[PDB]
Each structure stands twice: as structure tokens, then as C-alpha cells.
Design a protein around this ligand. Structure first.
Ligand SMILES: CCCCCCCCCCCCCCCCCC(=O)OC[C@H](COP(=O)([O-])OCC(O)COP(=O)([O-])OC[C@@H](COC(=O)CCCCCCCCCCCCCCCCC)OC(=O)CCCCCCCCCCCCCCCCC)OC(=O)CCCCCCCCCCCCCCCCC
Ligand SMILES: CCCCCCCCCCCCCCCCCC(=O)OC[C@H](COP(=O)([O-])OCC(O)COP(=O)([O-])OC[C@@H](COC(=O)CCCCCCCCCCCCCCCCC)OC(=O)CCCCCCCCCCCCCCCCC)OC(=O)CCCCCCCCCCCCCCCCC
Ligand SMILES: CCCCCCCCCCCCCCCCC[C@@H](O)O[C@H](CO[C@H](O)CCCCCCCCCCCCCCC)COP(=O)(O)OCC[N+](C)(C)C
Ligand SMILES: CCCCCCCCCCCCCCCCC[C@@H](O)O[C@H](CO[C@H](O)CCCCCCCCCCCCCCC)COP(=O)(O)OCC[N+](C)(C)C
Ligand SMILES: CCCCCCCC/C=C\CCCCCCCC(=O)O[C@H](COC(=O)CCCCCCC/C=C/CCCCCCCC)COP(=O)(O)OCCN
Ligand SMILES: CCCCCCCCCCCC(=O)SCCNC(=O)CCNC(=O)[C@H](O)C(C)(C)COP(=O)(O)O
Lengths: 56, 175, 52, 88, 459, 69, 178
């Protein structure tokens, strides 16, 4: 049943997939700007007994 | 109620007189007040009681955020962008807090003018003087900065004022 | 519209109000001026020494 | 509510009423088909006074170009009827 | 910022691979979805802008503009699909592609971190707009309009390019944050005077400033409906946004370089409002009204106060919504009677009552009825101007009167009186048109409840 | 006597208004009921001091449950 | 309103119109019925004084100076019948007049109500469609080669003919349409 309706409605995945991919690339871009993570005079903090980073 | 600090938002002891009837006629206001009470204020109070019963079951809190004190713009050297950034953010937060201080004082002034009735011109002089002091200080700090204001422009304004005041005092000492 | 109506206070106006409340309480509890015409400490400023 | 819809019959009774209240017209010899100038012996000024009486009657003004030609009571009835949208 | 941008790009192949009878449905659905996602940029930190990355950032100045762009795209699609019904599938896809490319260029321009990227995108917006006007424009006059729109814009923007590269050679950077933190005063010299002019004239011609405004009646009148919508709602605001950004490196020179532009904008406010009173074309009237509103925005930006910047932001947003609504309203009647003359069709309230309600509401927001955001912006600008000089009230007061006059004149001429006897092809309003009007109007009214969102960075 | 009143067609405006009301309400009645249920059963948080050595999460600085979420 | 105008007014028409205007303005000045009746008879007499003048030039000058007198002595606020072109109800019901062609755009559900009215309307439309060509041909027959000379239209002359250009005169909305 679903063959040809997939073949005629598959275009409805392009924009949600682009949204997900953009969120992913924004996270990857964030991963490049960590030079001052937990290093600012205003927010520098002592790590909790188990946490690794103050933000990801 | 106790929710807000009565030192920041003060009000006088609230003297109200006792009813001294002078006639045999019934006062329709008090009867209307009993009717209003027993038709409106009791159902509303019961509804609020139930709502707060449901509130107490699930009690959670939030915390006011506290900010350290970082070096200001005076102790940042000329091209150090990180010290400048943190100093500018701190100056902006202080500007916001000063706006809110002026807001509190203005609220006091307005509440006094309304409360004192026909005697506001004499009974609200302290509120007026307090506003005048706060307004003068706020004006010196931030007026004429313009849009695109910054901590550096506020510092330049302060320094210009300090130079003028120093020179005035110096030529007054020669008098 | 609902999402925009319930946006968290990232503009920090509640925080600013509470901060001003603390400051006003402390300052007129101690008899200090509500605000100072100098935004920055005059001891951290080094004006040019001579003016004539 | 307001006035009942006009009926040609009430119209024509009213025009005849005003016409026999006119001193220059013989009542016992006026008909709904009587020509003003030709049968009743009037001139243009009499006819003008007659249209003005008709507007005073029915409370609405008649244009001069249209009136020039209302030369018998039936023509006045037809004019008023077609103006006020009465079919019966 | 990538999360908003990639889906917009995705819209491109989604429309190129869609079935011939589903292009409008698909584009509208996913445009609306993109608009919803964008809605999340309105959360602003306070002290500073949100810097997503080195290349993109969002501001409180920026967030309102982006949401308006993304929201305007589906409305343009709804307005277009009627007069484009006879078109081939490929040309319909090309038209939608033009609209999508325009949205993509606009989103990037508002969020670019540095001026050279802002300049490139701000100039790239010219190509799709020109193609839309000259290819889908109804009249012969569209070709002339396209030339006017192109040349007026480039004659301003090329000196800006020279000035920008010179500024980066002398300062070392064009990044807006570095530009702001390392700002130094502009001396009073001939070199600095011409640098100021080269930094300002492009945005002046985009607004448009009075006397450099002649391209706008041509281009806005000869364009198809979606072209006119995007030209009035968003493309005029590029000048305001760019000026608000660029005036940080221009102090203290602006104190006296602003005088002729303030004089032009105030007097030309009066002039274009008066022009609206004797206009035989209905689109021409809406165009000149836009000019009058943008003159107010120019004054607000030139006087450089926090209240004036807040008023300018609010007025930009409100104008963008109201002007698009007015253009769509005029286009419905044009679709009926195939003429732009205002006295051709009269007494339309007797034939189309709900459309008359839409007309009344659009005319009421155009004259800035309280407490609409049009009046919020106008009132804030008027107060700042009063502080600047108390004599501005006379000009401001006069403008308010003439605006009420021509707004209600348009309403009365098109909706009231008796219908033209001969025209008998005025069919009932379609659901599409009513929904388009509501989707313009509901957002404006909703904005009154939360004024701070459209207020800007100064707030 | 009852005459016919010549009016333009009111079917299409009425249908548009019914459709708009229908969709607005379709999604906005559940939101109103949900906000009421949250406000009544969950409620806002109360201001408290930051306990010793504790560090709150970023969302624990706001009081309304919907804003917190 | 209903009659085709002529190229000009004759001396007689001008005189009658001035008579009517003078009488109406005199009634405006003379509020009460008896006093107006008296002065209107005096007016009619003063009007009849020059009734049988044969010199056209002196009659024209009499008319001219009479018009000057009327203009100097007119009422600044004459009585107007309420639905007349200056009346307080002049165009009051124009917002209620809807053209009949709007009825064809009605939804079928709207025409489901009123079936008899719409059947009779289809009959009227058939009548107009079957009369149009005869109307056009008749107008072309009865009209001089150099175009028409006045705005007058001929009646029907044959058996089942209708007067040419009748549809928008017969199907006027109404004068109290709601
Ligand atoms: C103030 C009253 C408070 C009432 C409380 C409830 C209000 C709910 C309304 C919500 C918003 C209205 C939506 C606008 C589009 C209309 C939709 C439509 O087509 O109607 C079809 C519908 C179906 O009728 P129909 O029989 O099929 O035929 C309709 C025909 O087309 C023709 O039918 P018509 O001739 O009746 O025309 C429809 C109507 C609709 O046309 C309109 O113009 C309505 C919109 C008003 C003007 C809009 C621009 C002006 C700027 C004001 C911005 C305020 C917005 C605030 C936030 C609102 C959130 C949405 O036109 C008018 O009635 C005349 C409008 C003149 C209004 C002048 C008032 C100025 C400001 C008043 C106060 C504003 C601030 C409030 C608080 C102040 C401090 C306490 O008709 C209606 O329902 C009538 C609409 C009701 C009138 C509302 C007017 C006042 C409300 C203003 C905003 C509400 C503020 C609420 C805050 C609490 C206070
Ligand atoms: C429409 C169709 C056509 C199209 C038209 C265009 C439509 C376009 C719409 C576009 C979509 C818009 C979406 C916007 C969403 C915005 C939502 C939002 O912002 O929520 C805000 C806000 C949310 O509250 P919150 O800040 O989150 O909560 C704070 C607290 O924690 C909370 O406090 P709490 O928890 O203590 O309170 C308890 C709780 C519940 O309270 C209670 O249960 C108790 C209440 C007291 C009752 C006491 C008496 C009752 C019991 C007595 C009898 C029984 C007991 C006795 C029995 C025995 C007797 C012997 O309170 C509530 O839940 C209030 C209801 C909230 C409803 C919000 C609805 C938003 C809908 C959004 C979508 C829009 C869809 C539109 C259609 C929706 C359908 C209408 O809700 C309100 O603002 C409600 C307003 C209340 C106003 C009170 C009256 C003030 C009037 C003064 C001004 C007027 C003066 C005169 C003016 C001038 C006249 C001349
Ligand atoms: C036709 C029939 C008419 C009759 C029927 C009328 C029915 C009633 C209509 C009137 C309703 C009045 C409602 C009044 C508002 C009540 C709620 C209001 O207060 O919400 C506001 C908030 O409104 C929203 O902010 C509106 C946001 C704007 C919506 C945008 C829609 C999506 C964008 C669409 C495209 C936009 C393009 C332009 C972008 C710039 C302000 O909330 P606030 O006082 O703080 O709340 C305090 C407590 N909180 C904060 C916890 C909630
Ligand atoms: C139709 C819409 C078009 C857009 C509008 C464009 C507006 C551009 C106008 C520019 C505003 C002012 C330009 C420069 C500011 C002052 C100009 C000058 O006249 O002022 C005096 C300048 O003195 C003399 O006037 C010299 C200039 C005279 C020569 C210029 C020719 C002006 C004729 C008008 C031509 C129209 C130009 C626009 C073309 C369309 C000031 O004395 P001074 O303190 O010593 O000079 C200050 C500069 N210093 C400090 C470096 C020394
Ligand atoms: C659609 C119509 C728009 C028209 C806009 C035209 C006006 C644009 C503004 C002026 C354009 C040229 C400005 C040059 C770009 C700035 C570069 C700069 O600032 O460098 C200056 C150089 O300044 C100049 O050389 C500019 C001189 C002008 C040359 C071209 C003249 C063109 C016409 C000028 C007047 C028109 C401008 C306003 C017209 C507005 C439009 C009506 C200083 O550098 P140095 O050479 O190193 O000097 C210090 C070291 N010795
Ligand atoms: C207060 C308001 C102001 C009032 C001031 C007005 C002043 C008016 C003074 C009097 C005006 C004159 O005498 S005006 C003098 C004009 N003289 C003539 O017309 C003489 C020739 N007569 C004819 O042509 C016809 O007999 C004719 C008379 C038309 C009748 O015709 P019928 O019988 O076939 O209808």
C-alpha cells in the first residue's frame, strides 16, 4: 500500500531533516569555542564530584 | 502582606476611625457590605483555600542568581578585549539595577501622593526630596550618553565632571 | 503566542528588581545615599595631574 | 411601525381630494382623466400651483422637468406610483 | 542560526521535487513550520546579543526582523497562487524559488557578524527582487521600474563598499563586536565627512530618504503582489537595520552631519503625506504612505537616543505588517476589476462586508490608533524628537493629521457611497483572501499585549 | 406583505468565520485547560536561599513551571 | 429625473421655474399658512401683471431683474423636502440598495431557500435574453445616421416587443429596499 504514497509524499522529510541537521551543526560549532569554558572571572566554578564540563 | 519587604515599600500606621452613627436610619452601605461578604468574599476564600491546599502538596523553589564582582572598566588596559567584555557586562547589569532603584523611589512617590489626599504637598516632602537626590545621581551617571552607550563613555563623562569640579575647587581655594 | 508569553526571564528584570531591593534596604538602613553621582571609584582614576 | 404601503386607490383619492379643494376646478365636472389646460381651462401657473399642492400632499418634491407634463390627474397618479414603488 | 537556515535551503529541493499540483501546499506548510522554529530567537539574554558562532549572531534588534521575514513568506505564497494559476509548472517553481532565495538572503543579512558579509547579502537581495518585478510584473512599465530600483540602490551601495574596505584597513576588523568595543571618535575633517556620507547614503537610499525616493512608487506599483509585499514589509527595513548598526563608528560627527537628513525627512514626511491626498492610483497611495512612515524612522535613527531607537524598531515592525496588509487588500479589488484606479470601484462595503472590516482595521492601524504598536513607535519617536527640539511637535503634529486624512480618504473612496452600476463581476470573498487578511492582522493585535518583544536592544 | 430582500451572498464570509473560530479554538481550548491545570495543581515556585555548597541548574532560577520547562 | 432633457430651456420654462422657486422661498420666509397664502396671491398677481407682454426683449429684462431680486431676497436656509437633493434623508437608503446580479453569486444552499422567487427570476432572465436582439435592431432602425440627437428612447411597436433598454429601468432595487 505504502509504495507509491511514499513515492509521492517523500518530500515532506526534507525540511524536518534539514532542521535536525542544522541543530547538529550548531552543536558542532559550539564545540569549537570552548577556550574559556569555566575560565571566566564571573562564572568560574568548582566542578561537582562527578561532572566533567560546566557546559557542552 | 509579608510577601514584600515593608522597609523598601513603607507605609504609615494606617489610622482609621470607628463608626459613630448619629441617626436611627439604617446605613445601606454596611448592609451591602454584609451581602457582598457572604456572597463573594466567602466563596472566593474557599476556592483559594482549595487552591493553596493543592499548592502545598507540591512545593518547589527557585533561587535568585548571585553575580560575583569582576574588575571594572577603569582597571582594563586599552586593548584587552576580555577584561573590557566582562567590565562592560558588569556595567550594564549595574545600569539595570540603578534603573530599578529609581523605579522603587518613583513608586514610593506615587503611593504617597495618592495616599495623602489633600495634604500631599506637605505630607510627601521627604518622598519628593528622596526622589530628587536619586534623580540627580542617576542623571549624572547616565544622561547624555546616547544610544550606543558604554562603560567607556560613562567613564569619560565622569572624568570630565571630575576635571571641572577639581578646577572649580582649585580656583575657589584661591579665593 | 503561548510560547512567547511564557518565555523565561532571561532579560533579568526580576533579578534586577530583587537586586535593587537589596541595595535600597542596605543603603537606607545604614544612612547611605541611595545613589552616587560617580559610577566608578574616584580612587581608581588617575586624572592628569596639572590643569593649567 | 410606520405608514402602510401606499395603494394606487388611496393615491388617486388623495389627488382628487386636493383637486376639488382647488377653487378654479369644478368638482361636479372634474374627472381622473380631465386635462388641466384643455378641459378645465387653466394655464401654466395654475398647473404649477397644482404640482406644488401635490408635493405638499405627498411630502416629496417633484422635479420641474418631469412636472412640465403632468397635465391630468391620472398622470400625477402614475408619477407618484412609479416614484414610490406601488403596483396596486 | 544553522537550525533556521538549513530547512529554508531545504525548501528549495522540496519544491523542485514536488508534484505539479502540490507545490503551494508543500511550500506553505513548511514555510509556516520554519516561522514557528524561528519564533525561538525572541529569547534574549539582556546585557548582550546571542552569539551562535563567529559568523552569525542574533540581537533584540534582529530577532523581530527575522520573525517578520519568515512569517511573510507563507503570506506571499497565499497571495501569489491566485494570479499564477495559468502559469506552467516550471515557471511556478521558479517563482517560488525566487521567494525562497530572497528569504534565505534576508535571514543571513540580519545575522551576519561582520559588515562585508552583511554587505554581500544586503546586495544579493537585489537579484531575486529584480527578477520578480521584471518577469512577473503585469505592466510594460515594470522594465523601467526595475532599472530605477537597481540603479538607485547601487549608486548608494558602492561607496559603502569602498568605505568598508578602507575602514577594515585602518581598524583591522569589520566584526561588529570588535567595531563596537574599540570605537573611537570621528574627527571633524573633510576625509571623515566623506567617510560618514559613504557609510550613510546606501542605507538612506534603502529607506528611502525623501528626494531619493523616486524608485519606490515605480517599483512597488509595478511589482506583482508578493514582490510588493516583500518590498514594503522587509526590504525597506534593511536601511534602518544597517543604519542602526553603522552609526556606532560615526560619533561624534553625527551631531551635525545629521542636520540635512533630518530636514529632508521631516519636510518630506509632510510632502509625501500631502501627496497621498491627491492620488488616482490605489497602490501609489500605499507606496507614498510607506515613504512617510520611513521618514519618521530616519529621524528616529539620526537623533541617536534610546527612546528613538526603541520607537524606530517598533515602527519598523508595525509598518511591515500594516503595509503588507494594505497591499494585499488593494490587490483583491484589482483582481476583481483589473484596474488600479481608486474611483473605478466604489461602495464595495455593500458588496463585500467582511473585506470592508479588514479595510477598516488596516486603515485604523495605518493612522496609528492606540494602543497599537504603530502608535507606540510613533509616540516614542515623537517624544525623543521633542527632547531633541520642542519645535518638532509642529511638524510631527501636522503629519499625524494628514495621515488620518488620507487613510480615511482611501477607506471612504473605496468602501462607501454607492457601487459603480456597470461593474457586475464582483464575486464573494474567497476563504484564501480572508485568511490572508486575518494572518496579517492577528499578529499585529497580539503584539500589543507584549510590546517589549518588538522594542529592541535598548529596552 | 413579506418581500424578498436582495443581499449579496453571506455564505462565504460566514463559512470563513466558522472555520477560523474552529481552528483557533481547536488548538486553544486544550492550551487554556492545560495552563489552568498546571497553575492549580503545580503552581509557581517560592523564593529560597541557595543551600550550602549547592549549585542550582539554570532553569531553577525561574518561578513559573511553564517557563521553567 | 425620468424625462430626457432638451438642448435648452425656453423663456416660458425659465419663467415657470422662477415662479416655483419664488413661491417656495416665500413659503420659507412666511412660515404660517395664512400669511404665506396672502403673500403668495400677491406674488401671483405681481407675476400676472406682465403676463401678456409681446416684446421679447422687455420680457427678458423683466425676467433678469426678477432673478436678481430673487437672489438678493432668497432664504439662506429654504425648506427642503427630506429626500430631496439637499434634504436630511436625501441618500439615506443608498447603502441598502443591492444590484440584482448579486443574486447569481449566491450559494446553492442560499437559493434552496426561496425556490419560487428564483424560478420566477429564471423566467425574467429568459425574457431579457430573448428580447435583447430585437431591442438592438429596433434601436438601429429608428435612429438617424448621425447618431441619436436626444436621450429619448422609443417604445415597443410590434406584437411581443419590449421597449428597448428596459432591464435596468424595470429592475431598479427599490427606494426602501430593506
Ligand atoms: C474595547 C472593547 C472590549 C471588548 C472585549 C472583547 C474583544 C474581543 C475582540 C478581539 C479582537 C478583535 C479582532 C479584530 C478583527 C475583527 C474580526 C471580524 O471580522 O469580526 C467578525 C465578527 C462577525 O460579525 P458578522 O455579523 O459576521 O459581520 C461582521 C462585518 O464584517 C462587520 O461587522 P462590524 O461592523 O461590527 O465590524 C467588526 C468590528 C471589528 O473590527 C475592529 O476593528 C476590531 C479591532 C479594533 C481596532 C483594531 C486596531 C486599533 C488598535 C487597537 C489595538 C488593541 C489590541 C489589544 C489586544 C487584542 C488581542 C487580539 O468592527 C468594529 O466593531 C469597530 C471597531 C472600532 C474599535 C475601536 C476601539 C479602539 C480601542 C479600544 C480599546 C483597545 C485596548 C483595550 C484595553 C484598553 C485599556 C483597558 O464580528 C465581530 O465579532 C466584532 C468584533 C468585536 C469588536 C472588537 C472591538 C474592540 C476590541 C479590540 C481588541 C480587543 C482587546 C481585548 C483586551 C481586553 C480589553
Ligand atoms: C476566538 C475565536 C475568533 C478568533 C479571535 C482572535 C483570537 C486570537 C488568539 C490567538 C492566540 C493567543 C494565545 C495567547 C496565550 C496567552 C496565555 C497567557 O498569557 O496567560 C496569562 C495568564 C496566565 O497566568 P500565569 O501568569 O501563568 O499564572 C500566574 C499564577 O501563578 C496563576 O495564579 P493561580 O494559579 O493562583 O490561579 C488559579 C488558576 C485557575 O483559577 C481558578 O480555578 C479559580 C479562579 C477564581 C474563582 C473564584 C470563584 C469561583 C468559585 C466560587 C464558587 C464555588 C465556591 C463556593 C461554592 C459553595 C458556595 C456556598 O488561574 C488560571 O488558570 C486562569 C485561567 C488561565 C487561562 C489562560 C487562557 C489562555 C488561552 C491561550 C490561547 C488562546 C485561545 C483563545 C480561546 C480560549 C477560550 C476562551 O492568564 C491570564 O492572564 C488570565 C487573565 C485573568 C484576568 C482577570 C480579570 C482582570 C480584568 C482587569 C482589566 C479589565 C478592567 C476593565 C477594562 C476596561 C473596560 C471598560
Ligand atoms: C470575532 C469574535 C470576537 C469576539 C470574541 C473575543 C474573544 C476575546 C478576545 C480578547 C482576548 C484578550 C486577551 C488579553 C491578553 C491576555 C493574556 C496576555 O496577558 O498575554 C500577553 C502575552 O501575549 C503574547 O506575548 C503574544 C505574543 C505575540 C504572538 C505572536 C504569534 C506568532 C508570530 C506570528 C507572526 C508574527 C510576525 C511579526 C513578528 C514580529 C501578556 O502576558 P503577560 O502579562 O506577560 O503574562 C503574565 C504571566 N505570564 C508572563 C507568566 C504569562
Ligand atoms: C535630494 C536628496 C539628496 C541627498 C542629500 C545629501 C546631503 C549632503 C549634504 C552634506 C551635509 C554637510 C556637508 C559638510 C558639513 C559642512 C559643509 C560646509 O559648508 O560647512 C562649512 C565648510 O566651509 C565651507 O562651506 C566649505 C564648503 C563649501 C564647498 C562645498 C559646496 C557646497 C554647495 C552645495 C552643492 C550641493 C551638494 C549636494 C549635491 C546633490 C563649515 O565651516 P568649516 O569649519 O571651515 O569646515 C568644517 C570642516 N573642517 C573642520 C574640515 C574644516
Ligand atoms: C543613489 C544616489 C546615492 C549617491 C551617494 C553618493 C555619496 C556617497 C558618499 C561619498 C562617496 C565617496 C566617498 C569615498 C569613500 C570613503 C573613503 C574614505 O573615507 O577615505 C577618505 C578619502 O576621501 C575622499 O577621497 C573622498 C573625495 C570624493 C571623491 C569622489 C567624489 C564623488 C562626489 C562627492 C560628493 C557626493 C557625496 C554625497 C552625495 C549623496 C547623493 C546625492 C580619506 O582617506 P585618505 O585619502 O587616506 O585621507 C586621509 C589621508 N591623507
Ligand atoms: C422671498 C423670495 C424672493 C422672491 C422675489 C421674486 C420676484 C418676482 C417678481 C415678478 C416676476 C415677473 O414679473 S417676470 C416678467 C416676464 N414676462 C413675461 O413672461 C410676459 C410673456 N408671457 C408669457 O410668456 C407666458 O404667458 C407666461 C407668463 C410664461 C405664462 O405662460 P402659461 O400661462 O402658458 O403657463
Amino acid at each position: 500500500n505504502v509504495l507509491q504514497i511514499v513515492r509521492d509524499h517523500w518530500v515532506h522529510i526534507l525540511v524536518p531533516v534539514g532542521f535536525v541537521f542544522g541543530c547538529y551543526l550548531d552543536r558542532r560549532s559550539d564545540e569549537k569555542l570552548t577556550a574559556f569554558r569555566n575560565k571566566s572571572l564571573l562564572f568560574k566554578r568548582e566542578l561537582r564530584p562527578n561532572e566533567e564540563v560546566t557546559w557542552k | 502582606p509579608d510577601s514584600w519587604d515593608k522597609d523598601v515599600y513603607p507605609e504609615p500606621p494606617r489610622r482609621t476611625p470607628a463608626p459613630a452613627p448619629q441617626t436611627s436610619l439604617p446605613n445601606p452601605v454596611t448592609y451591602l457590605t454584609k451581602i457582598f461578604d457572604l456572597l463573594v468574599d466567602r466563596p472566593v476564600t474557599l476556592a483559594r483555600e482549595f487552591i493553596e491546599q493543592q499548592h502545598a502538596k507540591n512545593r518547589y523553589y527557585y533561587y535568585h542568581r548571585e553575580f560575583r564582582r569582576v574588575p571594572d572598566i577603569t582597571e582594563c588596559e586599552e586593548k584587552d578585549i576580555l577584561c573590557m567584555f566582562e567590565a562592560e557586562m558588569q556595567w550594564r547589569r549595574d545600569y539595570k539595577v540603578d534603573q530599578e532603584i529609581v523605579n522603587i523611589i518613583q513608586e514610593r512617590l506615587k503611593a504617597c501622593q495618592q495616599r495623602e489626599g489633600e495634604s500631599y504637598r506637605q505630607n510627601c516632602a521627604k518622598e519628593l526630596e528622596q526622589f530628587t537626590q536619586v534623580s540627580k545621581a542617576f542623571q549624572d551617571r547616565y544622561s547624555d550618553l546616547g544610544a550606543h552607550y558604554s562603560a567607556r563613555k560613562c567613564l569619560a563623562k565622569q572624568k570630565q565632571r571630575m576635571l571641572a569640579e577639581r578646577k572649580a575647587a582649585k580656583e575657589a581655594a584661591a579665593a | 503566542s503561548t510560547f512567547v508569553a511564557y518565555l523565561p526571564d532571561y532579560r533579568m528584570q526580576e533579578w534586577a528588581r530583587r537586586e535593587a531591593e537589596r541595595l535600597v534596604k542596605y543603603r537606607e538602613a545604614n544612612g547611605l545615599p541611595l545613589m552616587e553621582s560617580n559610577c566608578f571609584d574616584p580612587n581608581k582614576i588617575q586624572l592628569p595631574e596639572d590643569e593649567d | 411601525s410606520d405608514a402602510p404601503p401606499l395603494t394606487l386607490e388611496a393615491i388617486k383619492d388623495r389627488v382628487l381630494y386636493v383637486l376639488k379643494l382647488y377653487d378654479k376646478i369644478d368638482p361636479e365636472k372634474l374627472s381622473v382623466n380631465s386635462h388641466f389646460m384643455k378641459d378645465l381651462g387653466l394655464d401654466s401657473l395654475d398647473q404649477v400651483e397644482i404640482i406644488m399642492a401635490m408635493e405638499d400632499e405627498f411630502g416629496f418634491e417633484i422635479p420641474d422637468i418631469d412636472a412640465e407634463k403632468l397635465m391630468c390627474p391620472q398622470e400625477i397618479v402614475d408619477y407618484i406610483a412609479d416614484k414610490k414603488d406601488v403596483y396596486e | 542560526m544553522l537550525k533556521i537556515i538549513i530547512p529554508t535551503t531545504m525548501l528549495l529541493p522540496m519544491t523542485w521535487m514536488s508534484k505539479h499540483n502540490m507545490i503551494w501546499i508543500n511550500a506553505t506548510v513548511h514555510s509556516l513550520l520554519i516561522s514557528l522554529i524561528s519564533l525561538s530567537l525572541l529569547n534574549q539574554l539582556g546585557e548582550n546579543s546571542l552569539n551562535f558562532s563567529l559568523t552569525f549572531f542574533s540581537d533584540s534588534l534582529s530577532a523581530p526582523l527575522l520573525v517578520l521575514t519568515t512569517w511573510l513568506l507563507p503570506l506571499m505564497l497565499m497571495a501569489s497562487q491566485s494570479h499564477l494559476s495559468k502559469e506552467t509548472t516550471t515557471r511556478k517553481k521558479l517563482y517560488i524559488t525566487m521567494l525562497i532565495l530572497l528569504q534565505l538572503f534576508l535571514i543571513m543579512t540580519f545575522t551576519a557578524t561582520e559588515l562585508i558579509l552583511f554587505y554581500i547579502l544586503f546586495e544579493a537581495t537585489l537579484v531575486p527582487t529584480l527578477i520578480i518585478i521584471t518577469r512577473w510584473g503585469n505592466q510594460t512599465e515594470r522594465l523601467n521600474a526595475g532599472l530605477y530600483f537597481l540603479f538607485y540602490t547601487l549608486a548608494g551601495s558602492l561607496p559603502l563598499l569602498v568605505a568598508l574596505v578602507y575602514i577594515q584597513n585602518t581598524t583591522g576588523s569589520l566584526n561588529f563586536l570588535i567595531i563596537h568595543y574599540w570605537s573611537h571618535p570621528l574627527s571633524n575633517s573633510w576625509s571623515n565627512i566623506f567617510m560618514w556620507l559613504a557609510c550613510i547614503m546606501a542605507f538612506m537610499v534603502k529607506m528611502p530618504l525623501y528626494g531619493l525616493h523616486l524608485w519606490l512608487p515605480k517599483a512597488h506599483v509595478e511589482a506583482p503582489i508578493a514582490g510588493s509585499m516583500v518590498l514594503a514589509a522587509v526590504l525597506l527595513k534593511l536601511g534602518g537595520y544597517g543604519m542602526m548598526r553603522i552609526t556606532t563608528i560615526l560619533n561624534p560627527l553625527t551631531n551635525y552631519m545629521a542636520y540635512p537628513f533630518l530636514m529632508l525627512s521631516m519636510w518630506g514626511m509632510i510632502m509625501t503625506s500631502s501627496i497621498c491626498l491627491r492620488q488616482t492610483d490605489l497602490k501609489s497611495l500605499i507606496a507614498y504612505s510607506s515613504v512617510s512612515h520611513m521618514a519618521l524612522v530616519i529621524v528616529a535613527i539620526m537623533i541617536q537616543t534610546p527612546w528613538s531607537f526603541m520607537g524606530a524598531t517598533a515602527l519598523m515592525i508595525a509598518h511591515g505588517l500594516t503595509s503588507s496588509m494594505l497591499f494585499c487588500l488593494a490587490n483583491t479589488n484589482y483582481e476583481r476589476v483589473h484596474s488600479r484606479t481608486m474611483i473605478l470601484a466604489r461602495g464595495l462595503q455593500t458588496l463585500l462586508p467582511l473585506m470592508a472590516t479588514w479595510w477598516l482595521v488596516a486603515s485604523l492601524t495605518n493612522l496609528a490608533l492606540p494602543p497599537s504598536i504603530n502608535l507606540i513607535g510613533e509616540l516614542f519617536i515623537i517624544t525623543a524628537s521633542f527632547s531633541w527640539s520642542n519645535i518638532t511637535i509642529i511638524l510631527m503634529g501636522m503629519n499625524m493629521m494628514i495621515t488620518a486624512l488620507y487613510s480615511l480618504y482611501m477607506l471612504i473612496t473605496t468602501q462607501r457611497g454607492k457601487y459603480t452600476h456597470h461593474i457586475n463581476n464582483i464575486k464573494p470573498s474567497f476563504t484564501r483572501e480572508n485568511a490572508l487578511m486575518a494572518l496579517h492582522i492577528l499578529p499585529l493585535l497580539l503584539l500589543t499585549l507584549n510590546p517589549k518583544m518588538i522594542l529592541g536592544p535598548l529596552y | 406583505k413579506r418581500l424578498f430582500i436582495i443581499k449579496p451572498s453571506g455564505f462565504y464570509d460566514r463559512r470563513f468565520l466558522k472555520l477560523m473560530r474552529f481552528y483557533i479554538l481547536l488548538t486553544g481550548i486544550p492550551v487554556a485547560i492545560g495552563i489552568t491545570l498546571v497553575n492549580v495543581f503545580i503552581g509557581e515556585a517560592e523564593l529560597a536561599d541557595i543551600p550550602e555548597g549547592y549549585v542550582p541548574e539554570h532553569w531553577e532560577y525561574f518561578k513559573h513551571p511553564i517557563s521553567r520547562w | 429625473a425620468f424625462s430626457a432633457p432638451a438642448a435648452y430651456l425656453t423663456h416660458q420654462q425659465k419663467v415657470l421655474r422662477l415662479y416655483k422657486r419664488a413661491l417656495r422661498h416665500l413659503e420659507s420666509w412666511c412660515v404660517h399658512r395664512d400669511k404665506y397664502r396672502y403673500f403668495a396671491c400677491l406674488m401671483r398677481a405681481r407675476f400676472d401683471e406682465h403676463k401678456n407682454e409681446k416684446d421679447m426683449v422687455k420680457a427678458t429684462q423683466l425676467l433678469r431683474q426678477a432673478e436678481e431680486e430673487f437672489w438678493y431676497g432668497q432664504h439662506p436656509q429654504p425648506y427642503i423636502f427630506p429626500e430631496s437633493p439637499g434634504g436630511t434623508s436625501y441618500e439615506r437608503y443608498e447603502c441598502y440598495k443591492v444590484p440584482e446580479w448579486c443574486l447569481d453569486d449566491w450559494h446553492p444552499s442560499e437559493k434552496a431557500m426561496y425556490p419560487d422567487y428564483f424560478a420566477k427570476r429564471e423566467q425574467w432572465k429568459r425574457l431579457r435574453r430573448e428580447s435583447w436582439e430585437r431591442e438592438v435592431k429596433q434601436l438601429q432602425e429608428e435612429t438617424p445616421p448621425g447618431g441619436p440627437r436626444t436621450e429619448a428612447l422609443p417604445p415597443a411597436r410590434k406584437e411581443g416587443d419590449l421597449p428597448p433598454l428596459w432591464w435596468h429601468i424595470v429592475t431598479r432595487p427599490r427606494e426602501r429596499p430593506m
